[PDB]
Amino acid sequence: RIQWCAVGKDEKSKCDRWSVVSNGDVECTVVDETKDCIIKIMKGEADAVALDGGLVYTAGVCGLVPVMAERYDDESCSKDERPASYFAVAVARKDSNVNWNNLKGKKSCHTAVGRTAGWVIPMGLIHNRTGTCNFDEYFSEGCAPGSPPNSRLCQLCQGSGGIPPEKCVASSHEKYFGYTGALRCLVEKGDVAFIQHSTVEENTGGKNKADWAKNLQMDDFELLCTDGRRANVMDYRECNLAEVPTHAVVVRPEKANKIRDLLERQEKRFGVNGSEKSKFMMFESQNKDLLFKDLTKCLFKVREGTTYKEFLGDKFYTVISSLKTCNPSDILQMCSFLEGK
Ligand SMILES: CC(=O)N[C@@H]1[C@@H](O)[C@H](O)[C@@H](CO)O[C@H]1O
C-alpha cells in the first residue's frame, strides 16, 4: 500500500527486493529520471520518493510536500530539529588573492553540473546577487563535469588521460569530477572550488596518499565568504554558501500521514535496527545510494503541515528559486502555470 518511485534498474532491483520482503506492503514504479517521479506522484501512480533539495523545491511548487527526511548521524530519530547534511563552501588557494567580489573572469572548479554543492548553490547565488543567467560566461574558464564539450566550463577539465580522452565527462573518468576532483582542479588549475565543508579536510594531512594531495595541508586553503572576506577552512559555519538539508521523502498532501506510518512500519523491520534487517536493509545498497542515501541511519518525521519552503530554509530556498529562474524545467514551468504564481 505504497507505490515507491524507483529511478533506474538498480533502484528497481532493490525496490523489488523491498517489495518482496515487505510482503507486497511496498510496490514499485520504475522511471528513467528522478524528475519523472514528481509527475507520477501527482498522477497518483506513485506514492513517495526521496529527493534532494533542488527536486524538493520543484516537487513543492508542484504541490508535493516533504513528509520524512533522512538523518545521517545517530541511528536513533524522531525526538523536531531538521538535520543538516553539510555546508556548501567555496574554497580558494591560501596563496591567492581572489574572493567573492572579484570572482567573475576567474577559473572555477565544480563537482559537476546540476549538483547541489558544486553547481546549484554557487550559480544560484551568483544569479541572485548578479542577475545573470549566463553561467558559462561568468568565469573565464573552469571545469564543470557534464557541461557541453566545447564550452569554457569544460576547458579546465582534463580527461581520463587514456585513449578516449573523455574531457568534461560527469564520471570518475574525469579527474576533476566530484568533490575530491574539484579540489584537485583548484590545486592544479582553478581559482575557486565549489565543494562541501568536509572536502579540504578529507584530503589534507596525508589522508589522501595521492601525489597531488600528499603534502597538502588545511592552511593551504581558505573559504570565500559571500561578504568578500575569506575565512579559515574550519570556520565553514561562519562562512558557507548555504546549509544543505538532507534528502526528503515527498508525497501528495492527502497521503502524508498515511505514508509516514507505513515508512515507520518499514523502519521497524528493515531499518538500521530492523527486526528483520538481516533479510533486507532499507538504507543499504553497497554505497550506491539506491532509494535512500546509504549514509542514512533513520527517517525523521517532518512536522505535519510543513511545506517545501519551510523545509529547505530561507537561504537555500532563495538560491534554488534563484537558480531555477534561469531556464526552468518543463515541470517547474507547468506547475507554476497551473497555479497563480
Ligand atoms: C541576507 C540577504 O539579504 N542576502 C540574500 C541571501 O540569499 C544571500 O546571502 C545573497 C547572496 O549573496 O542573496 C540574497 O538574496
Contact 91, 224 (CB under 8 A): yes
| Best mutation site among 229, 240, 312, 318 for ligand 1 pocket (most ligand atoms within 8 Å of CB) | 318
Number of H helices, E strands in the chain: 12, 13
CA–CA separation, 70 and 95 (whole Å) = 39
CA–CA separation, 121 and 127 (whole Å) = 10
Cell numbers of 12, please? 528497481
Residue 30: DSSP 8-state: E
Query: Based on the number of CB atoms within 10 Å of its own CB, is 305 exposed (0-12), middle (13-18) or buried (19 or more)?
Result: exposed
* Element holding 67 (H helix, E strand): strand 65-71
Q: Can you state the angle between helices 34-42 and 53-61, rounded to 10 degrees?
A: 30
- 239 and 254, same domain (yes or no): no
CA–CA separation, 340 and 19 (whole Å) = 39
Residue 48: DSSP 8-state: B
- 116 and 27, same domain (yes or no): no
- 116 and 225, same domain (yes or no): yes
Q: Which atom of ligand 1 is nearest to the CA of 319?
A: 7
Contact 316, 122 (CB under 8 A): no
Q: Return the amino acid letter for 229.
A: R
Residue 219: DSSP 8-state: G
How far, CA to CA in Å, does 135 sit from each of 94, 139, 154, 319, 323?
25, 8, 12, 14, 10
Gap from CA of 28 to ligand 1 centroid (Å):
41
Gap from CA of 113 to ligand 1 centroid (Å):
22
CA–CA separation, 2 and 267 (whole Å) = 14
- 127 and 206, same domain (yes or no): yes
Contact 311, 248 (CB under 8 A): yes
- 230 and 299, same domain (yes or no): no
Q: Which atom of ligand 1 is nearest to the CA of 125?
A: 11
CA–CA separation, 98 and 73 (whole Å) = 35
- Residue written as grid cell 565549489: 194
CA–CA separation, 147 and 284 (whole Å) = 31
What residues are designated binding site for Fe(3+)? 52, 86, 179, 247
Show Cβ contacts of residue 6 under 8 Å, excluding neighbours closer than 6 positions.
12, 14, 15, 28, 29, 30, 31, 291
- 83 and 175, same domain (yes or no): yes
Q: Which atom of ligand 1 is nearest to the CA of 322?
A: 15
Cell numbers of 38, please? 514528481
Contact 90, 313 (CB under 8 A): no
Gap from CA of 338 to ligand 1 centroid (Å):
28
Nearest by Cα to 184 from 207, 165, 157, 166: 157
Beta partners for residue 300, in sequence order: 69
What residues are designated binding site? 52, 86, 111, 115, 117-118, 179, 247
The CATH number for 155's domain is 3.40.190.10
Q: Provide φ and ψ at 92, rounded to 5°.
A: -135, 165
- Residue written as grid cell 553540473: 113
286 is a domain residue? yes
| Ligand 1 proximal residues by C-beta, below 6 Å | 125, 128-129, 226, 315, 318
Query: Based on the number of CB atoms within 10 Å of its own CB, is 277 exposed (0-12), middle (13-18) or buried (19 or more)?
Result: middle
Protein residue with its CA nearest to atom 1 in ligand 1? 315
Residue 117: DSSP 8-state: I
Contact 291, 50 (CB under 8 A): yes
For residue 13, give its domain range.
1-71+248-308
- 18 and 78, same domain (yes or no): no
Gap from CA of 232 to ligand 1 centroid (Å):
21
Experimental method: X-ray
Q: Can you state the angle between helices 256-270 and 8-21, rounded to 10 degrees?
A: 80
Residue 232: left if φ>0, alpha if ψ -120 to 50, beta else—which one? beta
Q: Which atom of ligand 1 is nearest to the CA of 100?
A: 12
How far, CA to CA in Å, does 129 sit from each of 227, 319, 323?
11, 10, 11
Q: Provide φ and ψ at 281, rounded to 5°.
A: -120, 110
| Best mutation site among 57, 120, 129, 241 for ligand 1 pocket (most ligand atoms within 8 Å of CB) | 129
- 50 and 177, same domain (yes or no): no
Gap from CA of 324 to ligand 1 centroid (Å):
16
324 is a domain residue? no
Resolution, rounded to a tenth of an Å? 2.3
What residues are designated binding site for hydrogencarbonate? 111, 115, 117-118
Q: Which atom of ligand 1 is nearest to the CA of 128?
A: 13
- 124 and 180, same domain (yes or no): yes
Number of domains composing the chain: 2
Gap from CA of 104 to ligand 1 centroid (Å):
18
